[model samples]
Target: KIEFSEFTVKIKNKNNSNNWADLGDLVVRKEEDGIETGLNVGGYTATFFSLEESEVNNFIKAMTEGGSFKTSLYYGYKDEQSNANGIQNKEIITKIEKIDDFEYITFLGDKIKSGDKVVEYAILLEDLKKNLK
Candidate 1:
């Protein structure tokens, strides 16, 4: 379901923890297509599907454009079905990077530390951003 190195962002609900687990290797593959969406850890692929045509294009650009072209990730939350899973509904490409065997995740903005690293789990990115307070 997901790659082992892909960063999975999970936004907390105003200081609460939901009983969620993990969805492995299941990446977002915008069908009628292939791995054009996005990918995570170890060069894994992963979303802006079903986004109101108004937002889908913009969202995809933000998610895939690589900082220089856009500068950062757009933000949003997870849909109900996606919520049922243990994934975070926070969306924001504030920052993302690969370190050693791990993908660093930074919520709201950025980081790196004993417990902090660059991360953007979205629904790969979106849900992970929205889950933030």
Candidate 2:
């Protein structure tokens, strides 16, 4: 499988500006079109670590201002043997815009690779601390 790291932002409360958290070093995994063997798919998996919560929160807020909330964050399901279920998380998508610099990578069963043309800003988070006065 292919693996890579990413930056993830988590918003605690859309109503409360200070209730936001950001995570860097996010683990990303992309499953192939048709390569589902058992439960796991033969694809690429990326992991990102050492993230600053404040910085991420700030970034999110800067993008999303006075916008609506979207879907919440969630984790992948545990293995069949595991008894504990995955935790339920929350995230806010205040604005839907596009940004440049985001890149996409492709993956094969044996090797992993990236594609050209980075995706621009697509979503924005609500910044509660700094508001337009």
Candidate 3:
């Protein structure tokens, strides 16, 4: 099973803390012929195909106005055991932080989130940019 990780983007605000809006999660898809280039998020997926370009554009517009969002890649999953401990059910945790510089490490066969409690995956902003039309 995959640990499940996603990309998050929030509007840039003066306060910055509450500015983090749930733009959506990134979906990683696999192709039968070859590796897929997109991941599912909200109502869209960042891929080399139609992963809802207009919707993504709307986000781009908001973000482009002045780079109004701090985009980040997060890794983790609900820790069911944590639920047993107390509040905040099984939650995702960060084994690694700041993959922002990465384009698509999976393509290069790199493991950014390596460990048993982690998922085997790779993501990039390039897919969205490349497929955005």
Candidate 4:
């Protein structure tokens, strides 16, 4: 089983005007080496939020405007090499059950280094808060 070692960021569109565009930049840092194997890695996830379905669609359109897409990286505790997974060129929507008055706007992402390269992982907005420290 893979363990999560960091937090995720949830981002809201800065510009009210929405169109096809890039999601934005993400940053992650190393925490510690694996306990058993000493595999040093870190990662972060990305998330976008919109109050309305239309807004969400616009945000997604902007992010997927170009052929470029999002992807993730995974490392095996016992092995030095890791694998990368790319996100599909489609937009996913999530309905918020409740919105609290004091909710914080953020996104989730990851930065990991396994063998020779450090990679990034973008997670869904809905999954960012749950099971996170």
Candidate 5:
């Protein structure tokens, strides 16, 4: 299996002339049955996605292929009833969309407990092409 620990995740600041802002680092860990992802936002680590084995592998493939990804990696909560109750119970979704040479990474969710008021970013796909030795 492929190995990875963490990577920097940034958000694009549109109000500031579209500069890249450091949202946080994304920490990834492999579990016995799946994968877990957490984002360090505002000095707090918010553990979000709990991905199954296939989904994690698929993400790696998509990232390596250097193309559009069809599916999105979302928050672990999949219960409709819990979501329907209130805004706090909704799921957070993260997606990477390819438009020309730019990759737009978006995070949609509540601003309360996630330690981020807004989580969105735009970066060149080439920025993620390199790896740390």
Candidate 6:
């Protein structure tokens, strides 16, 4: 459903005064019969999906046109003999803008880490839209 396979991203939140910090990469790659969409934060990974192909386009559109986009992501870490989900049904608010040579794609409302519980993500894009083309 998605166009590209990799993106450079960051983590931001109120705790950091809404500043973009180094989080990790975002991936939306093809996996056999389906697409694998996920975040790779310093080697730790979590995933989400686009229920419809159009949804992927919507996100890319938002990234290009500076509009707001929203989506829900679920995370459950069931390993090491336990059933516990650190994050679930996380609502993400996305917005985008270009500064100089690069575009900034912000994913707000998703939490990461424990020290401050930051709730935002961002993408440093050269081209998600042109990549689609």
Clashes of each: 41, 17, 9, 21, 1, 0
lDDT-superior candidate, 3 or 4 = 4
lDDT of 2 by residue, 30-87 (tens): 2232111111223423221111333343333333343322212222212111113312
Candidate 3 lDDT: 0.27
CA deviation > 4 Å runs, candidate 4: 1-57, 60-83, 97-100, 103-133
- What lDDT score belongs to each candidate, Candidate 1 first? 0.31, 0.23, 0.27, 0.28, 0.45, 0.46
Which TM-score value belongs to model 2? Answer: 0.21
Model 6 bad stretches (over 4 Å): 1-17, 30-35, 48-50, 68-72, 75-92, 98-101, 111-118
Models, CA RMSD each: 12.6, 17.7, 15.5, 17.1, 7.5, 5.8
Whichever of 1 and 6 has more TM-score, that candidate is 6
Question: TM-scores for all candidates?
Answer: 0.28, 0.21, 0.20, 0.20, 0.47, 0.55
- Scanning candidate 5 in windows of ten residues, the lowest lDDT window is 76-85
By the TM-score metric, which is better: model 1 or model 3?
1
Model number with the top TM-score: 6
* Tens digits of per-residue lDDT for model 5, 25-113: 56556666555656555665655455565465555544444333222344422221222333322333446666555665443433323
Where does candidate 6 have its weakest 10-residue lDDT segment?
Answer: 76-85
**Selected candidate, larger TM-score, 2 vs 6:** 6
Off by over 4 Å in 2: 1-42, 48-50, 66-95, 98-116, 121-133
Q: Please, what are the lDDT tens digits per residue for candidate 6 over residues 24-131?
A: 555655443323456565557766433233345555566555454334334422121111343423334567655445676665442343443445545555444555
Residue by residue across 1-133, what tens digits does model 1's lDDT show?
2222223342221111322223233233333322222323344333421223234344444544322122123222232233223222234443443433433332232232224433233223444333221
Candidate 3 C-alpha lDDT tens digits along 14-133: 111322123334443332322222334446443321112223333343222212211122222222122122221111121221244543322111122222232223334344334321
- Per-residue error (Å), model 4, residue 114: 22
lDDT of 3 at 4: 21
